Amino acid sequence: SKKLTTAAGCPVAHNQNVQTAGKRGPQLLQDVWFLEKLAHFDREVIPERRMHAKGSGAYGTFTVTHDITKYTKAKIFSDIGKKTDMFARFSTVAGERGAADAERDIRGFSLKFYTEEGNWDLAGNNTPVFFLRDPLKFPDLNHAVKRDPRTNMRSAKNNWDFWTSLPEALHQVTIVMSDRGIPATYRHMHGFGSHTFSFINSDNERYWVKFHFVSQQGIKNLSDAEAGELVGNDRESHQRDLLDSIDNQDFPKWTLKVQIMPEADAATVPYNPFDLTKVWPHKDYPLIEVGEFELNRNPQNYFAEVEQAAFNPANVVPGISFSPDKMLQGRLFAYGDAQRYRLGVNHQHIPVNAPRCPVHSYHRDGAMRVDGNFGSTLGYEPNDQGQWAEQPDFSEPPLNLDGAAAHWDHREDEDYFSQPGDLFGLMTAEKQAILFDNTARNLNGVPKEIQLRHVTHCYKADPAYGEGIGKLLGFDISEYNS
Amino acid sequence: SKKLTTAAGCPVAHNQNVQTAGKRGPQLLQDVWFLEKLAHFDREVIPERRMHAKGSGAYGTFTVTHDITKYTKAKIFSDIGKKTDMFARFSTVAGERGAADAERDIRGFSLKFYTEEGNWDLAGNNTPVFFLRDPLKFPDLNHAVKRDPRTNMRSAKNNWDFWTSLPEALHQVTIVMSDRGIPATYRHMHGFGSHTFSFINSDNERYWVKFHFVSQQGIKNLSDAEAGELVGNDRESHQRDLLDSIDNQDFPKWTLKVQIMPEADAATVPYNPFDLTKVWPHKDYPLIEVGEFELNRNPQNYFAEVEQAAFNPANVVPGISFSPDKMLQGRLFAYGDAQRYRLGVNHQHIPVNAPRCPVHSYHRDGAMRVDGNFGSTLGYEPNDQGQWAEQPDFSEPPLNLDGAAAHWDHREDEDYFSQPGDLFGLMTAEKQAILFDNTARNLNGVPKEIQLRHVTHCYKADPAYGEGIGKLLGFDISEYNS
Amino acid sequence: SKKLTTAAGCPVAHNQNVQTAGKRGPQLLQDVWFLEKLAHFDREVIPERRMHAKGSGAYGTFTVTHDITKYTKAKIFSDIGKKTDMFARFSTVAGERGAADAERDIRGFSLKFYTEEGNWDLAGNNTPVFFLRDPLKFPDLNHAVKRDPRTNMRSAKNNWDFWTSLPEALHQVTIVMSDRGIPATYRHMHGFGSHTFSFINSDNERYWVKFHFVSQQGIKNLSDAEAGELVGNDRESHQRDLLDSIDNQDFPKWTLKVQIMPEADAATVPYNPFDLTKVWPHKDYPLIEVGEFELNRNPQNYFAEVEQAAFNPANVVPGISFSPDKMLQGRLFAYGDAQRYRLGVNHQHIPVNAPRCPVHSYHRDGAMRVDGNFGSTLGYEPNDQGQWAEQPDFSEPPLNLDGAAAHWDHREDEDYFSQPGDLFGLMTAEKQAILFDNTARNLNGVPKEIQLRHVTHCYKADPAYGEGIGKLLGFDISEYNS
Amino acid sequence: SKKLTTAAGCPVAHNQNVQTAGKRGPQLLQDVWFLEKLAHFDREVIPERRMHAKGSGAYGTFTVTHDITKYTKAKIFSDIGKKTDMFARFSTVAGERGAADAERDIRGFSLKFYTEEGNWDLAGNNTPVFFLRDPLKFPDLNHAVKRDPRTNMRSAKNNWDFWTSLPEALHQVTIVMSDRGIPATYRHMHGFGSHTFSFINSDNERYWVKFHFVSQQGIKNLSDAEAGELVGNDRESHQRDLLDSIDNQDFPKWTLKVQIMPEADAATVPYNPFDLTKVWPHKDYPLIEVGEFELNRNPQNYFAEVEQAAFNPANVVPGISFSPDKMLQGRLFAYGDAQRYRLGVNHQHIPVNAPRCPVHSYHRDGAMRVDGNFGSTLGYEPNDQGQWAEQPDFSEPPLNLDGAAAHWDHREDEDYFSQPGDLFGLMTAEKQAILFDNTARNLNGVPKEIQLRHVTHCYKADPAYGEGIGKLLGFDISEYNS
Ligand code: HEM
Ligand code: HEM
Ligand SMILES: [Cl-]
Ligand SMILES: [Cl-]
């Protein structure tokens, strides 16, 4: 029971010395434990995630505290006090596997709720917005923010050339360059679904919805100087903090709140409600409390439960659906796809990914089939056994459409600057000074014409925002005020 | 259960019609069930086995009937009446996935015994010998007996050019060209370990051993004409027979018998006891009966239990070990290697491959890790927790060695023809004529110089053997006389 | 040079005998040539195709004979006498690698044209129609026509339960049960795109199109009895014929003809023009001649050129596009998905799949990257280098849409029987008798209620069609005439 | 030029906006550029190396300066002034992709020489020795020095529990805890083959050999405090240095020197000459200058040329071979094994891995076969076409052997401490204080019984070594005495 065996269950007699042809002779092929042990060792590693490769996870419990059942029939939300198992992974974005935790970056805020009608995956971020309006730009973002093909290092030129070429990116650039760019720990940041999603209620009415997760620990951040110091001591600071806190029974909590928009308002609101680079004003759609979750159990094995974790935005549950946010649409393809490659087609048989409700999922065979493959069950539908029966009671209402099939130009909406301006305007002088200093030092070494492209965008958001950065870089106002 | 869900447990509402932009419009990406179902479908297939790709499997039970505990300490054989669950896979060799069952070919006779001290895999054949003396020639044999690189069809010239270049191959060539080359069913053929292996007893004494599995149904074969007729009707004849026999409770049995040679005898016998192209004469080493098995249960799912089955000759149990047969030696590497590629590093977690005894196998991580991965258990040994403790009481005795590390030429042993001669001499005239006819027709269209090479080898086995084929082909006796 | 080396170019001295500790000792691990040779051998096999696994390929040339540039701007059709190289693969559907060539089945008719504006893949069939109207049924078809999960054999019950559950399948069921179900060779069958596609001209006007490939060798078929005799002798009959025909310089040819439907007609025609189970009457849309191709070159290596060939219906070229045929829509996802799994992400660097025109494809990294990965070229767009510039001149016209996003029920169109009834009406008494016999024998052993379901459908197509099978099965007319 | 196409060479019209059902409608599946672009993106990542994942590479040139042709027939050394092109990768050991360059760790020093008789791979380290005597302990070392299964962080307890269990590890622990544990740059460290290898001359005589690479830039190191400050600023410090140095034409250089031991001396020397934890004293075998290499080209693409680089210790060339060092013997299996998994079976067709000399490597098929697969060339040997002809002229002489096949206990050699003591004795008082300090801070938080185990080992090496650490930890000399 601490006794070593082979994978086939044979006792291992020799784990210290290989078999050789005499004391000083070469090694024998028939040391098969050596061959097995090293062959499994040689295959421990699987591909990292193409985005958010560096991260930390924990298990917890979501509890309903308020009634939103008029808007959604989702079983997770059905009764006050109702508890649901869940799993969260927090992460950086650009960093690879052993990259520093405490970098200036978006943080992933990824939740799996093990509901009675399926795993609901909400792969959120610590920001309500993102850089892009169209998912075609996503591989380009990755290539701009990660390592240069030649230098194998991040390139400020590549990063800023790309960002300055997409004025719609200004909102999230501002957020990442602000004081919230480096949370002090994963417990001291908020979470967001970011996208507009939808709620479907008992009567098949549709509402557009935003998910908000409010930290009960409050917001705490690190300056570039504090982060560099921390990173020099510990590339694993945020993992360390999450693990230690839960082991110390200091369980972090977040309050789920939602914004809910009747289907019809989408046609009338002054902002595109499906634009990922924009929020819905709280004045227009106030936050509505729903419940809270708390993270209260560390995984026993990081590789099995965290590295192998897969969150798919397409994994929704009755009462929760998508929206025509083009960014969300693209994500409906890319995650299942990336996860089948990264983890194997049968990766939902990995415990962390498995439903904790009845599952009868049809798909047969595939690599590493360990669940019995449904035994002798026939594989085709329609069939004379009524096997693999669809469930029409769960059918969503149609969605009205208007206009031709085409590549519609998102730049028809040129409101790239007002929401960033609003954000900047709300900052204290200290927060504005931090913003300015972070941006200016990030722009160091970046070719002047790219710098000026950014300063111009900041100016259009708010003249004080452009000027704050322009002054630090040594530009005359005339260079960026047109 | 009948109701259809996604892999994440979400009810599936539409399994008949995809989502489109209007009745006559193009398909929408947000049909996420379509993407999941097709993405899994697209990944059902895994690589087939490189050898013995076509096969049939069943479960059964082995029972000890005689006491051989004087020679082996293996728990499987420890008590008369002791029963052990097992899995068997029968197969052709050259045929791919949907190739005909009823071909002229060796048949695989592969057994997995779920013992209390590990899974014992014996991947045997329906013949006591093989074509080759050295494992380097194995890929060459595959390339000669399978599809030509250009034609994509088997090539008589490739096959016979290769066979005629290895005079040692004559024993197994004679067998495959004899009436035994096409068993009528898997139930009407014998099985053999083929290789010399070893038994180790309670006092750590070593014996060399051969395993023999004698069909209790007896031997039944098909002629080329009968097999062709059958194949034309049914490429699945042997699967159908095996499955149907078991479904009608006519369970096939085999009797295990062994030859046992004291270790010291191997230096004194007139033949090489580790030459896979040779048998041990029954006169020198009589068959010693051990027990019997029956196959009494069909797999519920063929892909998960038969296709994914992995038999590795290196999976031995205490009391059973290997020998210096170079062919056996090469197989100690190749199977685990082939199986990690074909099935994944964690394939021993697939139920058919899993031990039924205690397993504490050390290896961590790897693709599709579903077993918990030993949780938080440390991964290194030596350690201060007594974890992963080796088991020195199961240590095998040393093997004495003599001579330098070198590529010793097996052709020092030029006894290529005497055992084929003995086999031929024991055939009735009808069996000899069948041999002559099968060989002559197999050699059809093969260049004459290659045909002559084979006829010469046959003549050297027995003059009547060479002449029997020589006459059919129109050769003058002086052409192969010398 | 024919001298043997390692993969790293080191001379190999010993390819006949492995290195051992003495003449009769165990094998040494340091025989690294053995390890490398067997490790590569162990990895020769990749997954077969999930459908059409069994096949044959050849290179050839397409030549334009007629002017259709009024309808399409595609460069392949731009000038009379213009030659374009191509590769074709013909195949069965249900058979695995190694299954019989001469089975009753659809034949794949897959073409890759190496045009100056990209590879145009047309993955067609030897039939103008198919069994299904909706791509969700495809994995079900696979599972119904291939091996039973338990028996590992084809199942008449599974196949016919499935087909009788889909009355729309009757058209293709009729075709596959007719004398055309077994082509005598690949050269003696027609090819079809089957789907409605589109042509776009210089003025961006869209026409709907069907592609027809008319065999210049004529149609030749085999009966079940003739096919059985052939299979019994040769599982590779159609490969043998194609290879041998091309080596003998008897190059097979087909004439490309098209049906062309103005965009506005689609709304007015009495049949759904995007229904894969229906053809467009030649009376309404006569065949328009375009050109011809001949296959004149056998591949040098079958694995590298044929097995590794990837045909993706999404690989269209300017002037050729898709249609809202839901079956074609589903294919736009499945192939590239299946192919990246089967062949690797970078399979388009395999010579057979590579374009023979300017290519600058942007995708970076991925497994087995051999093309240089664009060197130091930056990887993001937009960028300040004008790199990865889109080509707006090649933009397609918008497609007009109407109606809500929904899973629209295709069974709104209940015209299941008229086109099968028409096809039957065109058959001679002899061809009808063959159809009746083929169907009755195919329904042998199938549960009576399933048989009756098919006969009922055949009855509704034409009373004589139903009665022909009904008689052979011993049914009274009252059992199926309602 | 600079224009975007699909992988099949079709021009891409829309790279900014995905195709939707109207301006604000959901995304259409038929946007096939989106699917292709995202599917390739989703598959960019391959597994990182199991050890030495973090690294930097460059191309250079080796020049022979002096004559050692008396001892080796290797072509690379055959003539003074002879130039050989090459590639080098330098690396850390424990860090993943993204981990800091400037950690306390062994550095990998890995060389590929493109010789006229094969690629000679020499995967060395920046140290002449290593922690272990037996290759079975390698996965244990990985699991001890990398991330704990539960915490996902490195563990001082795990690491030192393991190192203190292996007294033989002291030599390398001393070196990694010394000032040379953090090279300032890759240019400012030495390289070593570490293992005893062999040289074979024109007369087939064998010499044992050690390879040394002496930095022409000198040795320069960073203290823990200096390294932490650097890491806080830049995780890519060593990549940055190597890249910029070469771009600045400041080409780093190393002189190759060898130690050469006649075969006979191996039995007479007072140290095991095949013990990887030991050096050969310069007193007995002085360094003999051979040539130098410079690194003078940065790779064009890091992924394709550095990440995909594979160095296999078994890739030796005529004139150079192995030794019975158990650790070297194990590496002969593991690297090819790991690389086939990580990179694909055909990874030696990746340009950096490709030989420039004649290559005729035999192996057929396998994933991503892009080289032509030897076209129609037959695949078996022996054959009648002279194909795949072995090269017996390059045969190596036999190695005399003595003793039984057994798992021989290396702890028969109890000389664990003398060489670490010799090294300690040669350090200045300042470098000794640095050693004490690095070690004592490394032991922080490690259970006292483990700490004491290490101090005991150090004392055995030299009383002042043990006392130096003992003092800093607050132990009395009597607690770790003798
Ligand atoms: C929703 C409908 C369909 C789906 C999802 C589907 C799926 C597939 C898949 C996954 C493959 C293997 C691809 C590969 O690995 O390269 C394949 C092969 C093939 N299919 Fe389809 N199929 C569909 C309908 C059709 C139709 C309607 C046709 C004819 C018009 C067709 C013709 C072919 C041919 C010719 C091949 C073999 C291509 C080759 O020679 O490599 N399929 N199919
Ligand atoms: C039992 C002993 C050892 C085993 C089993 C082992 C195993 C491995 C493995 C699996 C890798 C990753 C290989 C790849 O994916 O390309 C690796 C990398 C490496 N190892 Fe070893 N190792 C051993 C000892 C050593 C020793 C003694 C040295 C130095 C003399 C060394 C130097 C290196 C270097 C430099 C690399 C990275 C090669 C590169 O730059 O791509 N290793 N090792
Ligand atoms: Cl994949
Ligand atoms: Cl592998």
CSV table of N, CA and C in Angstrom, one decimal, chain B residues 21 26-30 35 43 137 139-140 143 149-150 157-158 161-162 165-166 333 337 362 364 375-384 398-401 403-405 450, chain D residues 21 26-30 34 43 137 139-140 143 149-150 157-158 161-162 165-166 333 337 362 364 375-384 398-401 403-405 450:
chain,number,residue,atom,x,y,z
B,21,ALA,N,-30.3,30.6,-40.2
B,21,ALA,CA,-30.8,32.0,-40.3
B,21,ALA,C,-32.0,32.0,-41.3
B,26,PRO,N,-28.4,30.0,-44.2
B,26,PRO,CA,-27.2,29.3,-43.8
B,26,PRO,C,-27.2,29.0,-42.3
B,27,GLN,N,-26.3,28.0,-42.0
B,27,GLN,CA,-26.2,27.5,-40.6
B,27,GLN,C,-25.6,28.5,-39.6
B,28,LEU,N,-26.1,28.5,-38.4
B,28,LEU,CA,-25.5,29.4,-37.4
B,28,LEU,C,-24.4,28.7,-36.5
B,29,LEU,N,-23.3,29.4,-36.3
B,29,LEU,CA,-22.2,28.9,-35.4
B,29,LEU,C,-22.7,28.5,-34.0
B,30,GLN,N,-23.7,29.2,-33.5
B,30,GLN,CA,-24.2,29.0,-32.1
B,30,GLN,C,-25.0,27.7,-31.9
B,35,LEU,N,-21.7,21.4,-33.2
B,35,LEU,CA,-20.3,21.4,-33.1
B,35,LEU,C,-19.7,20.3,-32.2
B,43,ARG,N,-13.4,12.4,-34.2
B,43,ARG,CA,-12.3,11.9,-33.4
B,43,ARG,C,-12.4,10.5,-32.8
B,137,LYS,N,15.0,-7.5,-37.9
B,137,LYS,CA,14.3,-7.9,-39.1
B,137,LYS,C,12.8,-7.7,-39.0
B,139,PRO,N,10.6,-5.0,-38.5
B,139,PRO,CA,10.0,-4.0,-39.4
B,139,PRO,C,10.1,-4.4,-40.9
B,140,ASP,N,11.2,-5.1,-41.3
B,140,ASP,CA,11.4,-5.6,-42.6
B,140,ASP,C,10.4,-6.7,-43.0
B,143,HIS,N,7.1,-4.9,-43.7
B,143,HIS,CA,7.2,-4.2,-45.0
B,143,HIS,C,7.1,-5.2,-46.1
B,149,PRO,N,4.8,0.0,-51.1
B,149,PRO,CA,4.7,1.5,-51.0
B,149,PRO,C,4.0,2.2,-52.1
B,150,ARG,N,4.1,1.6,-53.3
B,150,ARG,CA,3.5,2.2,-54.5
B,150,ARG,C,2.1,1.6,-54.9
B,157,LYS,N,6.4,-10.8,-54.8
B,157,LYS,CA,7.8,-10.6,-55.0
B,157,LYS,C,8.4,-10.0,-53.7
B,158,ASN,N,7.8,-9.0,-53.1
B,158,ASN,CA,8.4,-8.4,-51.9
B,158,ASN,C,8.5,-9.5,-50.8
B,161,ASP,N,11.0,-12.5,-51.9
B,161,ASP,CA,12.4,-12.0,-51.9
B,161,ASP,C,12.9,-12.0,-50.5
B,162,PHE,N,12.1,-11.4,-49.6
B,162,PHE,CA,12.5,-11.3,-48.2
B,162,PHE,C,12.6,-12.7,-47.5
B,165,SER,N,15.6,-14.8,-48.5
B,165,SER,CA,16.9,-14.2,-48.1
B,165,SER,C,17.2,-14.6,-46.6
B,166,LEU,N,16.2,-15.2,-45.9
B,166,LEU,CA,16.4,-15.6,-44.6
B,166,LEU,C,16.1,-17.1,-44.5
B,333,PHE,N,10.8,-4.1,-25.5
B,333,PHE,CA,10.8,-2.6,-25.7
B,333,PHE,C,9.5,-2.3,-26.5
B,337,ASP,N,6.0,0.6,-26.0
B,337,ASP,CA,6.3,1.7,-26.9
B,337,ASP,C,5.2,2.0,-27.8
B,362,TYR,N,3.3,4.6,-9.2
B,362,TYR,CA,4.2,5.8,-9.2
B,362,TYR,C,4.0,6.8,-10.2
B,364,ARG,N,3.3,9.7,-12.9
B,364,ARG,CA,2.4,10.9,-12.6
B,364,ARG,C,2.0,11.6,-13.9
B,375,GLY,N,-3.4,12.0,-5.8
B,375,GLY,CA,-3.7,13.1,-5.0
B,375,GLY,C,-2.4,13.9,-4.7
B,376,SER,N,-2.2,14.2,-3.4
B,376,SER,CA,-1.1,15.1,-2.9
B,376,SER,C,0.1,14.3,-2.6
B,377,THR,N,0.1,13.0,-2.8
B,377,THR,CA,1.2,12.1,-2.5
B,377,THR,C,2.5,12.6,-3.2
B,378,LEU,N,3.6,12.8,-2.4
B,378,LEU,CA,4.9,13.2,-3.0
B,378,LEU,C,5.3,12.2,-4.1
B,379,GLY,N,6.2,12.7,-5.0
B,379,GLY,CA,6.5,12.0,-6.2
B,379,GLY,C,7.9,11.4,-6.3
B,380,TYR,N,8.7,11.6,-5.2
B,380,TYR,CA,10.1,11.2,-5.3
B,380,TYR,C,10.4,10.1,-4.3
B,381,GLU,N,11.4,9.3,-4.6
B,381,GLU,CA,11.9,8.2,-3.8
B,381,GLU,C,13.4,8.1,-4.1
B,382,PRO,N,14.2,8.0,-3.1
B,382,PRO,CA,13.9,7.9,-1.6
B,382,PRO,C,13.3,9.1,-1.0
B,383,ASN,N,12.4,8.9,0.0
B,383,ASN,CA,11.7,9.9,0.7
B,383,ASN,C,11.5,9.5,2.1
B,384,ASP,N,11.2,10.5,3.0
B,384,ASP,CA,11.1,10.2,4.4
B,384,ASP,C,9.7,9.7,4.9
B,398,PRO,N,20.3,-13.6,-10.3
B,398,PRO,CA,21.2,-13.2,-11.5
B,398,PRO,C,21.2,-14.2,-12.6
B,399,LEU,N,21.5,-13.7,-13.8
B,399,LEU,CA,21.8,-14.6,-15.0
B,399,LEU,C,23.3,-14.6,-15.3
B,400,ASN,N,24.0,-15.7,-15.3
B,400,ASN,CA,25.4,-15.7,-15.7
B,400,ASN,C,25.5,-15.4,-17.2
B,401,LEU,N,26.7,-14.7,-17.4
B,401,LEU,CA,27.0,-14.2,-18.8
B,401,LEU,C,28.4,-14.6,-19.2
B,403,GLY,N,31.1,-13.6,-22.5
B,403,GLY,CA,31.5,-13.1,-23.8
B,403,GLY,C,31.3,-11.6,-23.9
B,404,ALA,N,31.9,-11.0,-24.9
B,404,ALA,CA,31.9,-9.5,-25.1
B,404,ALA,C,30.6,-8.9,-25.6
B,405,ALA,N,30.4,-7.7,-25.2
B,405,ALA,CA,29.3,-6.9,-25.8
B,405,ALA,C,29.6,-6.7,-27.3
B,450,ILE,N,14.0,-16.0,-57.5
B,450,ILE,CA,13.5,-16.1,-56.1
B,450,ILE,C,12.8,-17.4,-55.8
D,21,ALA,N,-25.5,37.0,-39.6
D,21,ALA,CA,-26.9,37.1,-40.1
D,21,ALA,C,-27.4,38.5,-39.8
D,26,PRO,N,-26.3,36.7,-35.1
D,26,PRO,CA,-25.3,35.8,-34.7
D,26,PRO,C,-24.4,35.4,-35.8
D,27,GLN,N,-23.3,34.8,-35.5
D,27,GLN,CA,-22.2,34.5,-36.5
D,27,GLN,C,-22.6,33.3,-37.4
D,28,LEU,N,-22.3,33.3,-38.6
D,28,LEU,CA,-22.5,32.2,-39.6
D,28,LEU,C,-21.4,31.2,-39.6
D,29,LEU,N,-21.7,29.9,-39.6
D,29,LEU,CA,-20.8,28.8,-39.7
D,29,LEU,C,-19.9,28.9,-41.0
D,30,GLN,N,-20.5,29.4,-42.1
D,30,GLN,CA,-19.9,29.4,-43.4
D,30,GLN,C,-18.8,30.5,-43.5
D,34,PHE,N,-12.6,32.3,-40.6
D,34,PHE,CA,-12.6,32.3,-39.2
D,34,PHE,C,-12.3,31.0,-38.5
D,43,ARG,N,-4.1,25.4,-31.9
D,43,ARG,CA,-3.2,24.3,-32.0
D,43,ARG,C,-1.7,24.7,-32.1
D,137,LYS,N,16.8,7.0,-10.8
D,137,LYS,CA,16.6,8.2,-9.9
D,137,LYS,C,16.2,9.5,-10.6
D,139,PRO,N,13.5,10.4,-12.8
D,139,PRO,CA,12.2,10.9,-12.5
D,139,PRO,C,12.0,11.4,-11.1
D,140,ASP,N,12.7,10.8,-10.2
D,140,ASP,CA,12.7,11.2,-8.8
D,140,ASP,C,13.3,12.6,-8.5
D,143,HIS,N,10.8,15.2,-9.9
D,143,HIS,CA,9.7,15.4,-9.0
D,143,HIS,C,10.1,16.1,-7.6
D,149,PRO,N,3.0,18.2,-6.0
D,149,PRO,CA,1.7,17.7,-6.6
D,149,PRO,C,0.5,18.5,-6.1
D,150,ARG,N,0.5,19.0,-4.9
D,150,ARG,CA,-0.6,19.7,-4.3
D,150,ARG,C,-0.4,21.2,-4.3
D,157,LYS,N,11.6,21.3,1.3
D,157,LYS,CA,11.5,20.0,2.0
D,157,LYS,C,11.7,18.8,1.0
D,158,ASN,N,10.9,18.8,-0.1
D,158,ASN,CA,11.0,17.7,-1.1
D,158,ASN,C,12.4,17.6,-1.6
D,161,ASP,N,15.1,16.7,1.2
D,161,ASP,CA,14.8,15.3,1.6
D,161,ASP,C,15.5,14.3,0.6
D,162,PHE,N,15.2,14.6,-0.7
D,162,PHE,CA,15.8,13.8,-1.8
D,162,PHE,C,17.3,13.9,-1.8
D,165,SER,N,19.1,12.1,0.9
D,165,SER,CA,19.0,10.7,0.9
D,165,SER,C,20.0,10.0,0.0
D,166,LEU,N,20.7,10.9,-0.8
D,166,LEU,CA,21.6,10.4,-1.9
D,166,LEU,C,23.0,11.1,-1.6
D,333,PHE,N,18.1,5.7,-24.0
D,333,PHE,CA,16.7,5.5,-24.3
D,333,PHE,C,15.8,6.7,-24.3
D,337,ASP,N,12.9,8.8,-27.1
D,337,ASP,CA,11.6,8.6,-26.6
D,337,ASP,C,10.8,9.8,-26.3
D,362,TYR,N,15.6,5.0,-43.8
D,362,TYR,CA,14.8,3.8,-43.9
D,362,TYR,C,13.3,3.9,-43.4
D,364,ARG,N,9.6,4.5,-42.4
D,364,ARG,CA,8.5,4.8,-43.3
D,364,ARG,C,7.3,5.4,-42.6
D,375,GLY,N,9.4,7.7,-51.9
D,375,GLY,CA,8.6,7.3,-53.0
D,375,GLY,C,8.3,5.8,-53.1
D,376,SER,N,8.6,5.2,-54.2
D,376,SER,CA,8.2,3.8,-54.4
D,376,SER,C,9.2,2.8,-53.9
D,377,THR,N,10.3,3.3,-53.3
D,377,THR,CA,11.4,2.4,-52.9
D,377,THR,C,10.9,1.3,-51.9
D,378,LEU,N,11.2,0.1,-52.2
D,378,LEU,CA,10.8,-1.0,-51.3
D,378,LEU,C,11.3,-0.8,-49.9
D,379,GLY,N,10.6,-1.4,-48.9
D,379,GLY,CA,10.8,-1.1,-47.5
D,379,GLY,C,11.4,-2.2,-46.7
D,380,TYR,N,11.9,-3.2,-47.3
D,380,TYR,CA,12.4,-4.4,-46.6
D,380,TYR,C,13.9,-4.7,-46.9
D,381,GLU,N,14.6,-5.2,-45.9
D,381,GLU,CA,16.0,-5.6,-46.1
D,381,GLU,C,16.2,-6.9,-45.2
D,382,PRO,N,16.9,-7.9,-45.7
D,382,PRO,CA,17.5,-8.1,-47.0
D,382,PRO,C,16.6,-8.0,-48.3
D,383,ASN,N,17.1,-7.5,-49.4
D,383,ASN,CA,16.4,-7.4,-50.6
D,383,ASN,C,17.3,-7.6,-51.8
D,384,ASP,N,16.7,-7.7,-53.0
D,384,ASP,CA,17.5,-8.0,-54.2
D,384,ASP,C,17.8,-6.7,-55.1
D,398,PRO,N,34.3,-4.8,-30.1
D,398,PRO,CA,33.6,-5.3,-29.0
D,398,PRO,C,34.1,-4.7,-27.7
D,399,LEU,N,33.2,-4.7,-26.6
D,399,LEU,CA,33.6,-4.3,-25.3
D,399,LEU,C,33.6,-5.5,-24.4
D,400,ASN,N,34.8,-5.8,-23.8
D,400,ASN,CA,34.9,-6.9,-22.9
D,400,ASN,C,34.0,-6.7,-21.7
D,401,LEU,N,33.4,-7.8,-21.2
D,401,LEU,CA,32.4,-7.8,-20.2
D,401,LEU,C,32.9,-8.8,-19.1
D,403,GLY,N,31.1,-10.6,-15.4
D,403,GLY,CA,30.0,-10.6,-14.3
D,403,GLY,C,28.6,-10.9,-14.8
D,404,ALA,N,27.8,-11.3,-13.9
D,404,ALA,CA,26.4,-11.7,-14.2
D,404,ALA,C,25.5,-10.5,-14.5
D,405,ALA,N,24.4,-10.8,-15.2
D,405,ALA,CA,23.3,-9.8,-15.4
D,405,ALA,C,22.6,-9.7,-14.0
D,450,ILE,N,16.6,16.8,8.4
D,450,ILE,CA,17.1,16.8,7.0
D,450,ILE,C,18.3,17.8,6.8
